[PDB]
Amino acid sequence: RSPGVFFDSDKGKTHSSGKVLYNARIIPYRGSWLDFEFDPKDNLFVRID
DNA sequence: ATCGCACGGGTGGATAAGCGTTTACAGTTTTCGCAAGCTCGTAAAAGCAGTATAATGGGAGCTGTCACGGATGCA
């Protein structure tokens, strides 16, 4: 996979809703990763590595 | 021819026993030969204590992403 930023989604991870959760993701050549993501309350979250 | 029969001589035959001669199958004596084991000696291996300018908090390349259920365990 090429480095850079990459946006995707999931279809049916939370089965009790049926909603779509979008996530952003920065991928470097060398270093830590950095994900942004949504949750079924429409809040924005961050997990590093 | 031709041939037995007999008295008797010579023997062959069956054990048996004889003779001097050169090695067995019994048992010990002798010497020589080389070890396997013990004792030893020391040069090598093995182990131990110390070294006084000053020195004071890792991360160390890890993980790169699969997704589905059950039980667990806080809240």
UniProtKB/Swiss-Prot annotation:
Q: How is it used?
A: Co-administration of salinamide and rifampicin or salinamide and myxopyronin suppresses the emergence of resistance to both antibiotics.
**Disulfide bonding pattern of the chain:** none
Post-translationally, this protein is described as follows, namely: Acetylated on several lysine residues in the presence of glucose.
Q: How does it assemble?
A: The RNAP catalytic core consists of 2 alpha, 1 beta, 1 beta' and 1 omega subunit. When a sigma factor is associated with the core the holoenzyme is formed, which can initiate transcription. The rRNA transcription and antitermination complex (rrnTAC) consists of RNAP, NusA, NusB, NusE (rpsJ), NusG, SubB, ribosomal protein S4, DNA and precursor rRNA; S4 is more flexible than other subunits. In pull-down experiments interacts with CedA. (Microbial infection) Interacts (via flap domain) with Escherichia phage lambda antitermination protein Q; this interaction renders bacterial RNAP resistant to transcription pausing and allows it to read through termination signals.
Q: What biological function has been recorded for the protein in this entry? A: DNA-dependent RNA polymerase (RNAP) catalyzes the transcription of DNA into RNA using the four ribonucleoside triphosphates as substrates. Resistance to the antibiotics salinamide A, salinamide B, rifampicin, streptolydigin, CBR703, myxopyronin, and lipiarmycin can result from mutations in this protein.
Instruction: Name the family.
Output: Belongs to the RNA polymerase beta chain family.
* Record protein name field: DNA-directed RNA polymerase subunit beta
Full-protein interval shown: 151 to 199 of 1342
